[PDB]
Amino acid sequence: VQLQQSGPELVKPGTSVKISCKTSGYTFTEYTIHWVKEAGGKSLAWIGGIDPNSGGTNYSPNFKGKATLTVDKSSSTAYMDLRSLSSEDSAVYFCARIYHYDGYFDVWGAGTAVTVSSAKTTAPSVYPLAPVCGDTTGSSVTLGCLVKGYFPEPVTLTWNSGSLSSGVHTFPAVLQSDLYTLSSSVTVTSSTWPSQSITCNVAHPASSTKVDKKIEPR
Amino acid sequence: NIVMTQSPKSMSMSVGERVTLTCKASENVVTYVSWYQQKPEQSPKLLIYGASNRYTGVPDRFTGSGSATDFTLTISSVQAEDLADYHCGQGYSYPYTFGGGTKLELKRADAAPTVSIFPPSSEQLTSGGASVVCFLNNFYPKDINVKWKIDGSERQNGVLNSWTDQDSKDSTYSMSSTLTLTKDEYERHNSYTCEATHKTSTSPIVKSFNRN
Numbered sequence: 410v411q412l413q414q415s416g417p418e419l420v421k422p423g424t425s426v427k428i429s430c431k432t433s434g435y436t437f438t439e440y441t442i443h444w445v446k447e448a449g450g451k452s453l454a455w456i457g458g459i460d461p462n463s464g465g466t467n468y469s470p471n472f473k474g475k476a477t478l479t480v481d482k483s484s485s486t487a488y489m490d491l492r493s494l495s496s497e498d499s500a501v502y503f504c505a506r507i508y509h510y511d512g513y514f515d516v517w518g519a520g521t522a523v524t525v526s527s528a529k530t531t532a533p534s535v536y537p538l539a540p541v542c543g544d545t546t547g548s549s550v551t552l553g554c555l556v557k558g559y560f561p562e563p564v565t566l567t568w569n570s571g572s573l574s575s576g577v578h579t580f581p582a583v584l585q586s587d588l589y590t591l592s593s594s595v596t597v598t599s600s601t602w603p604s605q606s607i608t609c610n611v612a613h614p615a616s617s618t619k620v621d622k623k624i625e626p627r
Numbered sequence: 628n629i630v631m632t633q634s635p636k637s638m639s640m641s642v643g644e645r646v647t648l649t650c651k652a653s654e655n656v657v658t659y660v661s662w663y664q665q666k667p668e669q670s671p672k673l674l675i676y677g678a679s680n681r682y683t684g685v686p687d688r689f690t691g692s693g694s695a696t697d698f699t700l701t702i703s704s705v706q707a708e709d710l711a712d713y714h715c716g717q718g719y720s721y722p723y724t725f726g727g728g729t730k731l732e733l734k735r736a737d738a739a740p741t742v743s744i745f746p747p748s749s750e751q752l753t754s755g756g757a758s759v760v761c762f763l764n765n766f767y768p769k770d771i772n773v774k775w776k777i778d779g780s781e782r783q784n785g786v787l788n789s790w791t792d793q794d795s796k797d798s799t800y801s802m803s804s805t806l807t808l809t810k811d812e813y814e815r816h817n818s819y820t821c822e823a824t825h826k827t828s829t830s831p832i833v834k835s836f837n838r839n
Contacts, residue, residue, distance in 0.1 A: 443723070445671075453663075453671065453714050453725040469722045470628070503670055512718020513661040513676035520670055536748040538760055541836040551743040553760055555751075555805070578764060580789040580803040590787055592803045594743070594762040627746075 410434040412442075412504050412518035419524045419561040419615065425492040428521045430504035437485035438462040440506050443514065444476065444489045448500040458507065459487060494525045524561045528587040532616035533559035537609060538592075542627040551596045552624045554609040558588045564613045566593045573597075573607065629653050631660075633715050633726025639734045642798075646702040650715035650726050652695075659719035660698045662691055665712045667792035674713075675700060707733055708795050733798040739827035740766035740802070744820075744834040747813060757813035759806045761821035761834065765799040768826060773804045776820040776835075782806065813838070 415429045430442060443458035457468040459478040466478050475498075477490040487504060502521045505514040538553030556564055566579050576596040582589040595607065602624070609622045630653040640646050650660060658678040663671035673682045675691035678698060688703045702709060710733050715726040740763040747757040763771060769790065775782045785807045793800055804821060820835035 445725075452728040453716070455716075455723040455725065458723070467721045505671075507718065508676070511677065512659040512723070513673060514663070514671070514716070514718075515673050515676075515682070517670040517672065534751065534754065536751045536758070538745040538748065541744065541746065551741075551762060551764070553743075553745050553762060555748070555758060555760060557751075557756075557758065578762070578791050578801040578803075580791060580801070583787050583789050585787060590805065592760060592762075592789070592805065594764065594801070594803070596764070622750075 410506070410516045412506065412516055414502075414504060414518040414521045416614070417522040417524070417561070417563060419526065419530065420494055421527060422495055422525055424494055425490055426494065426523055427488055427490045428502060428523070430487040430489075430518050432485045432487065432506075437480075437482065440509065442478075442480070442487040443505050443507055444478065445503045445505055445514075446500050447503065447520070456489070456502075461487070491523070494523075496525050499523060499525045522562065526561065526587075528560050530615050531558060531560045531588060532618045533557060533564060533589075533611065533613050535609065535611045535620045535622050537622040537624045539624050539627050545599060548599055549596055550599045550602055551594055552602065552607060553592060553594045554611070554622065554624075556591045556593075556611050556613075558590070559613050559616065559618075560588055561615055562589060564589075564591060564611055566591070567610045568593070568595050569606070569608050570610055628722060629656060629717055629720065629724050631715055631717055631724050631726040633729055635729060636727065637730040637732065639732040640705050641734045642707055643704050646705045646709075646731065648700040648713055648715075648729050650693075650698040650700075652698070652717055655695050656717040656719035658694055659717055660691075660693065661716050661718065662689075662700045663714045663716065664709075665714065666710070666795070671714060705731075705733070707798050709733070710793050710795060710798070732793060735767050735798040737827050738765060738767045738799055740764060740771065740823050740825055740832055742821065742823055742832055742834040744836055746819070746836055746838065747810075752810055752813070755810050757808045757810050759808070759813075759819050759821075761804045761806075761823075762801065763804070763823050764801040765794075765797065766801070766825060766827070767799050769793075769800045770826065771800075771802055772824045773802070774822040774824070774831070775804070775806045776818075776822065777816045778818050
């Protein structure tokens with residue numbers, strides 16, 4: 410059983426956005442599909458559910474007239490339209506299946522991040538952070554990658570294409586003056602680097618950016 | 628609107644300790660209460676349904692109990708990987724509702740930050756900017772403060788800090804601090820220093836470099 414949610418959205422205040430939840434691995438008409446909001450640094454808030462077989466809906470009173478749930482039976486897909494959007498609506502939206510009439514959410518989608526903002530999409534600059542110049546004498550070495558001046562979220566960082574994952578710390582993006590900055594550190598043994606190659610790989614899908622910066626010694 | 632009141636708001640428990648979470652319904656919801664675990668950057672996942680039924684794949688250490696208005700989740704011996712936000716919900720009657728969540732932190736022995744400092748990349752300098760970055764890695768507790776110094780004088784403006792989520796294996800935190808200057812500012816001064824103040828030392832844990 411999979412609930413596959415559509416990708417992240419940047420939308421301007423006052424507009425609407427329609428997000429999807431494509432289901433598979435079961436008979437779509439046999440279970441109600443629900444939607445749940447989670448703003449950053451908050452609890453879960455139920456929006457509503459729809460029975461795809463009957464079309465019957467139930468809404469939270471706080472989302473009456475803000476959310477509209479539909480289905481497309483032919484593509485086993487559920488949709489939620491959110492209207493008259495404001496920054497209060499900036500959140501991750503999960504779809505989730507209720508197990509029959511037993512009132513528990515057994516399968517969840519990965520969520521869809523909706524950002525509501527007037528700010529303009531901007532590509533990041535990606536900078537390799539090699540250690541301070543000169544002889545290092547420690548058993549380990551730490552490298553970094555700085556991803557500065559982008560909008561909206563998200564970006565994805567790895568290091569060598571995800572094959573280097575232990576010893577990595579990727580710091581949550583911080584927003585300042587309509588632009589995000591994010592950084593990542595990676596710590597390896599000193600016999601690994603610079604003798605073996607290490608790249609930062611950054612993608613920012615919103616601006617069609619895909620950059621690889623190899624970390625070179627100063 | 629059935630209100631689910633969840634306690635505590637947050638807690639900090641050592642590996643091996645018994646953890647208790649409660650959820651109080653404002654009216655009778657019989658047994659239609661579930662608990663969800665939400666690790667950082669993930670969706671909620673079902674742990675307990677029907678008040679007391681462990682879902683498939685859920686380890687034995689999680690048990691739910693309760694009925695009518697009182698519900699409890701217990702982790703008999705908490706493990707490092709159990710850090711998460713935990714959520715209760717009722718699906719007795721519409722509208723369906725959730726408690727306010729419990730942020731479970733792992734308590735561990737104090738660990739000092741290991742600090743690394745990074746001068747601006749030649750790439751960024753070519754572009755007219757200059758960011759100096761300091762990583763403060765793998766410390767506990769989370770409380771930490773950073774001070775930037777340029778040629779011995781404190782610099783407060785242009786600093787952006789960010790903390791990771793607690794690590795699921797070693798239960799530490801890490802923090803990034805970035806001082807952003809103009810290129811002209813950066814090429815003017817020589818010594819750049821970040822100073823971390825943390826519980827593990829009565830003196831600042833420092834790192835610096837000379838541009839020249």
